[PDB]
Amino acid sequence: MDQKASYFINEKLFTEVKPVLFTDLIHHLKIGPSMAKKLMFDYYKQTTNAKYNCVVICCYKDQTIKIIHDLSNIPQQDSIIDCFIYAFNPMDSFIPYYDIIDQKDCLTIKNSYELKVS
Amino acid sequence: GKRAFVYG
């Protein structure tokens, strides 16, 4: 019932139109990447008049990791396990801009040598 | 009648 995420995605999609790639979701919720996949699926499931669809990355790998642009086709990933949905885009192309984000809360896997101020 | 003739 986590619609607390969904309206926050709704401003960034709509009231201004900069796309979320991943990092806004992890900044907002600090949910798991599997849970972020569930959330983006839920947004896709509860889509009402998306201006344009997202394209997914595919979890099934076979020594390949490809953003799908042959959406109907199955590009070398035939016996598919799963997909991780992200990069919901208003535009023709999928480009975000990239920025420093808060990560001390958000880092899923920390550094083998943690940084020291010294 | 004729026009643009005197102003020809």
Partner: protein, 205 residues
């Protein structure tokens, strides 16, 4: 200030040349997505290099930024070769500018670039969502709806000119002509950053 009209120059470069890209007034193979035309762009904007044309574009932007308080609304007009009738009129604004106030505060570089990236991406969105039929035979011309201007008489009155800066200024007042002065109008999301209020819309026919 100094940094704020640099941002206005980059924003108008992105706006103008992106309208030029999505109207196919120049061939798309000359365009490539980039961040550097003489400055730092907010988004990857498809820019053809063509140094006469980019000279023209930064010329026009340095013309519009030269007045900077008469202009309340910069715009882009779209004219066919077939008729002089306006195909689209893309709206931009210079309302409540920092530069007229000359306020030092506030820079907010990432925040102003954020709202600029938003307004650019909105321009992308409502430039693909109208279709592509008759994709060639379109041209470009500028229009400014401004509140209080007339500078074109500065060529006259037997003036004697000595400096290159006012040579440029006489070129600014020489290049601009007042014209003689609706069918559809579509909404565009503008940037709503504090000092730079750019309330940008679109017009159709």
């Amino acid at each position: 200030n100094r940094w704020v009209e640099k941002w206005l120059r980059v924003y108008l470069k992105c706006y103008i040349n992106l309208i030029l890209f999505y109207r196919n007034v120049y061939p798309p193979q000359s365009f490539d997505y980039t961040t550097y035309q003489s400055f730092n762009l907010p988004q990857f904007v498809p820019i053809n290099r063509h140094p006469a044309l980019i000279d023209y574009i930064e010329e026009l932007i340095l013309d519009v930024l030269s007045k900077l308080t008469h202009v309340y609304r910069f715009s882009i007009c779209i004219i066919n070769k077939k008729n002089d009738l306006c195909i689209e009129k893309y709206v931009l604004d210079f309302s409540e500018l920092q530069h007229v106030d000359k306020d030092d505060q506030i820079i907010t570089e990432t925040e102003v670039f954020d709202e600029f990236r938003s307004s650019l991406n909105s321009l992308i969105m409502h430039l693909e969502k109208l279709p592509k039929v008759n994709d060639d035979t379109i041209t470009f011309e500028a229009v400014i709806n401004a509140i209080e201007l007339e500078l074109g008489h500065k060529l006259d009155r037997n003036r004697r000119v000595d400096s290159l800066e006012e040579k440029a200024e006489i070129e600014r007042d020489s290049n601009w002509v007042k014209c003689q002065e609706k069918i559809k109008l579509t909404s565009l999301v503008g940037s709503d950053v504090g000092p730079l209020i750019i309330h940008q819309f679109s017009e159709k026919l």
